[PDB]
Amino acid sequence: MNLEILDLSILGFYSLISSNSFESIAILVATIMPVITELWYNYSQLFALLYTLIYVGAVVILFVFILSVINEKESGLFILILVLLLDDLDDNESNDNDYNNVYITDYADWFNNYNESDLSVIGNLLFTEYALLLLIISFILLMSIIGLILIVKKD
Amino acid sequence: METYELIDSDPKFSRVVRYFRPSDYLTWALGTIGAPGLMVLFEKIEPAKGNTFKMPPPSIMRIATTIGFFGGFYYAYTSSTKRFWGYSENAKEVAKDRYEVKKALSEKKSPYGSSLLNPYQQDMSARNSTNSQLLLAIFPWFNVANHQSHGIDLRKYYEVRDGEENWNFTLPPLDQVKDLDVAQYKEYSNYP
Amino acid sequence: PYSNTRRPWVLRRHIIMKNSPTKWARKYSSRRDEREQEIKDDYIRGMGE
Amino acid sequence: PYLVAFRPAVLVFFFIRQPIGAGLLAGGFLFWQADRHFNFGIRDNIHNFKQTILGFPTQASKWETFKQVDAQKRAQLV
Amino acid sequence: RGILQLFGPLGLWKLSTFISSKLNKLVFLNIGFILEIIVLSWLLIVFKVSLLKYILLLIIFIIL
Amino acid sequence: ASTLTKEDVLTRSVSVLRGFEVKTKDIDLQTTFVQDLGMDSLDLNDALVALEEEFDVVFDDKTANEIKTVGEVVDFVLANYLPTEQSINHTIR
Amino acid sequence: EQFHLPQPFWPTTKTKEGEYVPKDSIREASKVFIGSGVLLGGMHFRRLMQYKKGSARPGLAKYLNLFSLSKSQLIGFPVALGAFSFLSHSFANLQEGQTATGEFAASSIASLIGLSIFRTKKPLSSNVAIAVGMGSLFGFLTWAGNFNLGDNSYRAALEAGNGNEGGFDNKVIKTERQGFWEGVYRRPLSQTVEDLGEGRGIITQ
Amino acid sequence: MLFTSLLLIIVYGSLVNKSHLLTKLINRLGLIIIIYTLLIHLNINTLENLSIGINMFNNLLLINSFNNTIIELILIICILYVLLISFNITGLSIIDNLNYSKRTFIVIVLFNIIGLTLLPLVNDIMILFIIIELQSYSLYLLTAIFNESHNSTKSALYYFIVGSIASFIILDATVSIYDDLGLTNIQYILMYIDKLEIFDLLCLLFGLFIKIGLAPFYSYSITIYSLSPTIITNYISLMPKLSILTLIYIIMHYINIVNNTDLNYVISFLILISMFIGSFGGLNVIRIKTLLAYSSLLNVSYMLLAILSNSNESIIAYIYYIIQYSLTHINIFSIILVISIYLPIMNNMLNVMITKYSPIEYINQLKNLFINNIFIAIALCISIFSLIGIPPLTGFYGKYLVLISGLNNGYVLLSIVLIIASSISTVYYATILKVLSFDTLSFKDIISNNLIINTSPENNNNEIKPEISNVISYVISSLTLIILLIIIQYENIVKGAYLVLLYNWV
Amino acid sequence: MDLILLMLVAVGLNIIDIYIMIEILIMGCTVNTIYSASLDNDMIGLIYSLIQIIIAGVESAIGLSILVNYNRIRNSEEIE
Numbered sequence A: 001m002n003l004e005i006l007d008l009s010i011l012g013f014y015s016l017i018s019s020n021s022f023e024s025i026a027i028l029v030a031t032i033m034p035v036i037t038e039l040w041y042n043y044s045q046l047f048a049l050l051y052t053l054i055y056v057g058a059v060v061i062l063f064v065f066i067l068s069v070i071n072e073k074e075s076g077l078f079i080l081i082l083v084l085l086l087d088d089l090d091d092n093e094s095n096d097n098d099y100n101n102v103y104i105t106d107y108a109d110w111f112n113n114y115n116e117s118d119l120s121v122i123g124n125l126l127f128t129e130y131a132l133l134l135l136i137i138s139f140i141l142l143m144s145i146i147g148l149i150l151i152v153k154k155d
Numbered sequence B: 001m002e003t004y005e006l007i008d009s010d011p012k013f014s015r016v017v018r019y020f021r022p023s024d025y026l027t028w029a030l031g032t033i034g035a036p037g038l039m040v041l042f043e044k045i046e047p048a049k050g051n052t053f054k055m056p057p058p059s060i061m062r063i064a065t066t067i068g069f070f071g072g073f074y075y076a077y078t079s080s081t082k083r084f085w086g087y088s089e090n091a092k093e094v095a096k097d098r099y100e101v102k103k104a105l106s107e108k109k110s111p112y113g114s115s116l117l118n119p120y121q122q123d124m125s126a127r128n129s130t131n132s133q134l135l136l137a138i139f140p141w142f143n144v145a146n147h148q149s150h151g152i153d154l155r156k157y158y159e160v161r162d163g164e165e166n167w168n169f170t171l172p173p174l175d176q177v178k179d180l181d182v183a184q185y186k187e188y189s190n191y192p
Numbered sequence C: 001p002y003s004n005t006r007r008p009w010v011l012r013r014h015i016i017m018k019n020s021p022t023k024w025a026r027k028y029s030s031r032r033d034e035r036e037q038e039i040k041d042d043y044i045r046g047m048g049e
Numbered sequence D: 001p002y003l004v005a006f007r008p009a010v011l012v013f014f015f016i017r018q019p020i021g022a023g024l025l026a027g028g029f030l031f032w033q034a035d036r037h038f039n040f041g042i043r044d045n046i047h048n049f050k051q052t053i054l055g056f057p058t059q060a061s062k063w064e065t066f067k068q069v070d071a072q073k074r075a076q077l078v
Numbered sequence E: 001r002g003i004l005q006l007f008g009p010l011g012l013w014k015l016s017t018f019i020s021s022k023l024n025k026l027v028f029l030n031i032g033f034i035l036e037i038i039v040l041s042w043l044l045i046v047f048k049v050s051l052l053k054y055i056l057l058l059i060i061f062i063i064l
Numbered sequence F: 001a002s003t004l005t006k007e008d009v010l011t012r013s014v015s016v017l018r019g020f021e022v023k024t025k026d027i028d029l030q031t032t033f034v035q036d037l038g039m040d041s042l043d044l045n046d047a048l049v050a051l052e053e054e055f056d057v058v059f060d061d062k063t064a065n066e067i068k069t070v071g072e073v074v075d076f077v078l079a080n081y082l083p084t085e086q087s088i089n090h091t092i093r
Numbered sequence G: 001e002q003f004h005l006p007q008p009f010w011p012t013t014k015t016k017e018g019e020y021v022p023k024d025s026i027r028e029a030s031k032v033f034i035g036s037g038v039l040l041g042g043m044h045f046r047r048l049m050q051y052k053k054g055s056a057r058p059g060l061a062k063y064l065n066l067f068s069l070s071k072s073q074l075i076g077f078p079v080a081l082g083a084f085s086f087l088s089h090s091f092a093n094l095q096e097g098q099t100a101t102g103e104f105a106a107s108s109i110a111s112l113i114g115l116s117i118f119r120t121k122k123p124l125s126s127n128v129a130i131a132v133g134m135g136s137l138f139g140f141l142t143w144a145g146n147f148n149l150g151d152n153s154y155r156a157a158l159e160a161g162n163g164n165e166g167g168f169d170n171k172v173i174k175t176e177r178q179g180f181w182e183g184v185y186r187r188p189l190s191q192t193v194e195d196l197g198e199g200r201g202i203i204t205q
Numbered sequence H: 001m002l003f004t005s006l007l008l009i010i011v012y013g014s015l016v017n018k019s020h021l022l023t024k025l026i027n028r029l030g031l032i033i034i035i036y037t038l039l040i041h042l043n044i045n046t047l048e049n050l051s052i053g054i055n056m057f058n059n060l061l062l063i064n065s066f067n068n069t070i071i072e073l074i075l076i077i078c079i080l081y082v083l084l085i086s087f088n089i090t091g092l093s094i095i096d097n098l099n100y101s102k103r104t105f106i107v108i109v110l111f112n113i114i115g116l117t118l119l120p121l122v123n124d125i126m127i128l129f130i131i132i133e134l135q136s137y138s139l140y141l142l143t144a145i146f147n148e149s150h151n152s153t154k155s156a157l158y159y160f161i162v163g164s165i166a167s168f169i170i171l172d173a174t175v176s177i178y179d180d181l182g183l184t185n186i187q188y189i190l191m192y193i194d195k196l197e198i199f200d201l202l203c204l205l206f207g208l209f210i211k212i213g214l215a216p217f218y219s220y221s222i223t224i225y226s227l228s229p230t231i232i233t234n235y236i237s238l239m240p241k242l243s244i245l246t247l248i249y250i251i252m253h254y255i256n257i258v259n260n261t262d263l264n265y266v267i268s269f270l271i272l273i274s275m276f277i278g279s280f281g282g283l284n285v286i287r288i289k290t291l292l293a294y295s296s297l298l299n300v301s302y303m304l305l306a307i308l309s310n311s312n313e314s315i316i317a318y319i320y321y322i323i324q325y326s327l328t329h330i331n332i333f334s335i336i337l338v339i340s341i342y343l344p345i346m347n348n349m350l351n352v353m354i355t356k357y358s359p360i361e362y363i364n365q366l367k368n369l370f371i372n373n374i375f376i377a378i379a380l381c382i383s384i385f386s387l388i389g390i391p392p393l394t395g396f397y398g399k400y401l402v403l404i405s406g407l408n409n410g411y412v413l414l415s416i417v418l419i420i421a422s423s424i425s426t427v428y429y430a431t432i433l434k435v436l437s438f439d440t441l442s443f444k445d446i447i448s449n450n451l452i453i454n455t456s457p458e459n460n461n462n463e464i465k466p467e468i469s470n471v472i473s474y475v476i477s478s479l480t481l482i483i484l485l486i487i488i489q490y491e492n493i494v495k496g497a498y499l500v501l502l503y504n505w506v
Numbered sequence I: 001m002d003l004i005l006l007m008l009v010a011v012g013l014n015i016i017d018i019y020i021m022i023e024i025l026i027m028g029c030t031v032n033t034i035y036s037a038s039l040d041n042d043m044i045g046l047i048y049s050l051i052q053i054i055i056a057g058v059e060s061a062i063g064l065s066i067l068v069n070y071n072r073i074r075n076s077e078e079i080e
């Protein structure tokens, strides 16, 4: 009984009935949280946190910052339910039946006596192996800092 | 094609600057004073304000020199680099490189130098800086490390060419030179 | 431990996050599977010879 | 882990705010969860229908492909 | 002055004016308009490429 | 854009005028206000304000004592009609 | 003896006898009609849902009118696209391969059947000309060889030794007819007699 | 050279006061930075040594003799472009003060030049998705440089939204390729060119097709170009195509390894539609920038026919075409920025509103240019005639070479359509030429002191005062004769195209 | 039921709503990348995901900066 499915069904409903910009912002948070939680379990815990620190902590509270400076103004129920029920029939984004319905395993090895976190490897590669990517990204962030001022600052 | 001897596929920053021919400094000399001149010449071609010649502000003559200085260095830096790669005349440089490499081997020291980088990082710093000069116009990057992926065979420094027998160099076999791949893995094949 | 390797539920069930040019090809186009089925079929055709 | 804490609150507010709509989306959710629990074979057959119409390699087609290979190799020995 | 004018400058002025009238409606600043066509073009990748001639026939039908 | 024409103002003007005590129900461009309809100060102001509520055009103090006919008001709306600025949501999306 | 007319036709992959496994038009046309019926129909309902999301906004109503298919166009197109695919394959089987004539016939009849549904409020002469007009676009497309010549292109022919890369010679006179893109210095007289025909200065006067 | 001095200008820009004289002189320092970059680049990069292709920066960037040439092309067009803001175009302060108000105009250009040059060189998907953003963002910032304007800002918002969708399409394809193979570097992927899903490279191009404005995505490019100021539209309608058409060619070079027949048909469907829309689109338009926006779509359509064919004649055709269309595009937008000084002045009808951002906006504002400045009109006519294809102008060889590569690969249908769309397009290029001269003799006897140029005071009334600036007039004169007199050096220049190599070798 | 472009109904009817949809779409490509990187036990893919989060962050700022300036333009009269 995967309770993750129910939450998305709710979000798949309020997205269709969203009326004002309050609803759309709440869609973003209600999309991030199923992303963050399903990543905290299952695949990668490091990036479940890296989402919260950057997505919610930087952009989403900047979404609601600007939205307060924008505006605040202002089929039925059977069609919305019918749309969801037909949309819910197929939910296999892939079509490799063998790859979906067969489970696998990996065999652990004791060679890596130097156990380290996944972030240490990323730092060990992003700062040495792919330093150019890091230095270009710094350059892009420099462009934005100069870019954001010129657009907004009237003088 | 006008190929020559491949001195160093990845010349070091300190060695590129060292091998600046007197013409190369002149190029740097022109670029450092050419930039203030070009700003003046532009006012000659068309003044910024009005219809009459007006020397640009002294403040601009200072920044333009800085642009020319860091601009004229790269023309010198690129000119020297082409002599290492073999794209430019390097008879003068080959004599200098072979003397220093032979001196390094004779003193039982590595031609490349001691390094603060573990064997992986030397390999990593080779790939980042090698051939970076082909983009030196777009953005700078230099080979400042003492790595060993210079794409040469060190035995080409053993045989004696014309006009070198006078230096009276004695060269030990490669398995006894400090800071080399062949003379580092003597106990564990995983660690230097 | 034997486990599955399917994509996160939010990836394949959000009303918006599941729509992209390459995801529609995965979900509604047989061109990817027809080629990758031949390799699987060749496993059994190449036994007896 | 934040949804596990936030899930009790939102489910309560889904039935209070829109009770008729809640009884369907939650009710419909339980149907498919039950359907996979009890091997009703519905969603599997809704799936197999799509793979047949859109030219995909279906589960039945592979097993038919194996039979064709199996029947051919056996008569090759004879 | 007859068929060779219908199959000529006078006839081609009508056809050009008809088509160019349809096109000028499409150029209008709307985010929703440009969004649907981008999503619509994703169907080219999905469809088996044996069905390009039909889409071409349909696209001419919509011009009318 | 200004979608009002002269006829559109004239056609809808009568209905407002049919909503107030008028001596004659025949009103056109040539019809006056004070004379034909027998309206005094306070009576005429209500009709003039009423046309401001439907045509959404404000009449200034300069024209106040200079209004004598109903054709002038109909022609005035065209020269002074604009659509209210629409927010960023209505305009482009 | 026949007439000796020019033959302006691009080369195509000729499927010799025993090849050309026929395609089932009834099933092939079924997929187009059912497939195109769902897309236009489904998008028709989807755009209906957008009108009620917001209607006081002019922009949403403006652009939804561009994509607003009429009621007849919902039947006119799947009929035409369906009939196009049935008529195209059906003429292919008799002709043992698609040609411009087969596609021209299908494209005009498929348009006229389609046009007579959503272009009823127009004279029939106007619809026939449009149906004949749209037939010529597909005939021209098929005469030119779809979107590409494929193997019959000069590059593919050149890479297989059918080009003129090594120059020409006139002592080697090929009895077999040369390729489409191949050039020669000199040609057998019998080939000229087969093409130009005897008469006005060939062989006789 | 770019990175070192761009940071110097950024710090120096805000240190000095905001004055149009200091900003203009700072703009000239932008010109000097670009000029040095070209000398430094040409000094170290040669066609002989780059024929193989030389990996750089941990194989993230790979440069060969083909990408090298476009980098030299990008820098040279930018040098001519900066002459539009580093020098006076008209002379009158009212229309030229728009180019001197924004200090960060040149800084943003130098941000885009770094993005423009590195984009053809990307060799990994990780750096592809980054470099496309460094260039893409620089476009959105550039379109919004004039924040007082209402049209320029709405252009950037519309540009930002579509460009973000294109970026997501590009991002999604690279993630899909990564999911199938697990590899990042393009050279590593080439090993598995026979086993990845080839259409995922098509989904990658669909992202790049949006950014250059190819049908059916043409809608936004015409709207954006018709709204941004003429000084801005000259840069955003040409530069993104220089640095993306090259990247498209490199990807198409990889895709033709397998020679997928289904992929050619889909791209040919877009090429066929673009020529239709790019030709019939401009027949009924009144704006000059909207017309040139449709001209840009059609000439992008012609080039993509060469890219799709992708043979040894495509390199010769694409290299020559991209150079000649760039100079011609600079020549026309240089002229339109100068002939704004002959506009009449009222002393009304249709209440036509002309703003200082786009003084020339409608085609009928070119009237009597044969009378006012005949030499300029001939330069404009020559530039227009090149786009038509009148031989022996540079435009004629562009279509002659595209047809050679198009027909050599079997694109018979598209070649015939490309010609028909060349004939249809001639209608709305002749309209420009009709406006200039067709009424010359009926207006030869005219009394008119009501021009914009007549506002300037008479300085001496004896000394000869030229109507136009020295530098901008010389650029128009240099480019006009290149288009007209290319017949002399065409055989040698085409030989220069033979030497350009993209893994041809032998 | 995606080939009927159903997602367009789910988008709001403001410019700020379009911005949200794009970020959701870009977030879909990162979750797929983290899915691919983890299963392959590859840290090169997780570097890509980190870059996607960072790059998509900048794009959000530039979009809202343009929107804020655009919204200020309508209410830019400043008479008092």
Ligand SMILES: CCCCCCCCCCCCCCCCCC(=O)OC[C@H](COP(=O)(O)OCCN)OC(=O)CCCCCCCCCCCCCCCCC
Pocket (backbone or CB within 6 Å): A007, A008, A010, A011, A014, A015, A018, A022, A023, A026, A027, A029, A030, A033, A034, D006, D007, D009, D010, D013, D014, D017, D018
């Ligand atoms: C801790 C949980 C608390 C939950 C409080 C709200 C519960 C209602 C269910 C919302 C969650 C479903 C996911 C969809 C996101 C919300 C979109 C939405 O439309 O919310 C509607 C909410 C209820 O109002 P309603 O009457 O139902 O709709 C018409 C309102 N005129 O009206 C609103 O606009 C919401 C007003 C408060 C907004 C707060 C921020 C949104 C909630 C963030 C935390 C919840 C995280 C998501 C949890 C569910 C995940 C699927």
Ligand SMILES: CCCCCCCCCCCCCCCCCC(=O)OC[C@H](COP(=O)(O)OCCN)OC(=O)CCCCCCCCCCCCCCCCC
Pocket (backbone or CB within 6 Å): A089, A090, C028, C029, C030, D046, D049, D050, D053, D054, D055, E040, E041, E042, E043, E044, E046, E047, E048, E051, E054, E055, E058, G031, G032, G033, G034, G035, G036, G038, G039, G040, G081, H216, I001, I002, I003
């Ligand atoms: C419970 C099931 C739930 C399923 C969810 C989806 C429901 C169906 C929704 C509509 C489906 C239509 C598209 C079908 C899938 C896309 C096409 C495809 O992938 O091929 C399937 C079908 C037949 O393919 P087939 O010949 O069997 O391939 C076997 C090869 N070995 O291909 C076809 O022949 C389909 C017919 C398509 C041709 C007519 C429609 C195209 C013209 C209108 C397009 C609309 C406008 C688009 C314009 C493009 C923009 C430039």
Ligand SMILES: CCCCCCCCCCCCCCCCCC(=O)OC[C@H](COP(=O)(O)OCCN)OC(=O)CCCCCCCCCCCCCCCCC
Pocket (backbone or CB within 6 Å): E022, E023, E025, E026, E037, E040, E041, E059, E060, E062, E063, E064, G040, G065, G066, G067, G068, G069, G137, G141, H216, H272, H273, H276, H277, H417
């Ligand atoms: C409902 C199904 C939706 C299918 C959408 C398909 C998407 C891709 C379409 C390709 C062209 C992109 C055009 C931009 C999107 C089209 C917008 C649209 O379809 O709206 C219809 C539009 C307005 O129609 P209108 O009559 O003014 O309004 C009716 C209101 N009741 O009428 C139009 O003007 C649209 C036609 C534009 C012209 C396209 C022509 C392309 C080339 C076709 C001929 C090929 C040329 C070569 C032919 C010979 C070689 C084969």
Ligand SMILES: CCCCCCCCCCCCCCCCCC(=O)OC[C@H](COP(=O)(O)OCCN)OC(=O)CCCCCCCCCCCCCCCCC
Pocket (backbone or CB within 6 Å): E006, E007, E008, E011, E012, E014, E015, E018, E019, E060, E063, E064, G130, G137, H272, H275, H276, H279, H417, H420, H421
């Ligand atoms: C002898 C040598 C001569 C050389 C040229 C010979 C060919 C010339 C072809 C001309 C024949 C048609 C032109 C005259 C027919 C009149 C067309 C027309 O006016 O529109 C009719 C119809 C709507 O009717 P209505 O708007 O009321 O017009 C009544 C006018 N009496 O509206 C329509 O029916 C329009 C039809 C839809 C448009 C279809 C467009 C498809 C492509 C047509 C060809 C364009 C080129 C394509 C390839 C190049 C671009 C890629």
Ligand SMILES: CCCCCCCCCCCC(=O)OC[C@H](COP(=O)(O)OCC[N+](C)(C)C)OC(=O)CCCCCCCCCCC
Pocket (backbone or CB within 6 Å): B044, B045, B046, H470, H474
């Ligand atoms: C010695 C070898 C180098 C040659 C010089 C190159 C730069 C020119 C600077 C000269 C000084 C100057 O520009 O002086 C100014 C003059 C004259 O200006 P005017 O139009 O009469 O304005 C009025 C000036 N009054 C008031 C003095 C009369 O302008 C020129 O000459 C314009 C020539 C255009 C540049 C030609 C070079 C093209 C190179 C093409 C490479 C792709």
Ligand SMILES: CCCCCCCCCCCC(=O)OC[C@H](COP(=O)(O)OCC[N+](C)(C)C)OC(=O)CCCCCCCCCCC
Pocket (backbone or CB within 6 Å): E008, E009, E010, E011, E012, E013, E014, E016, H420, H423, H424, H427
């Ligand atoms: C295969 C044989 C090739 C023969 C040559 C090509 C056909 C001749 C067309 C000349 C038309 C002309 O000249 O255009 C002149 C015409 C109209 O004239 P106008 O000045 O507006 O006068 C009329 C004034 N009214 C109408 C106000 C009363 O403009 C147009 O319709 C512009 C569009 C022209 C389309 C050209 C397409 C070419 C396709 C060729 C391949 C089939």
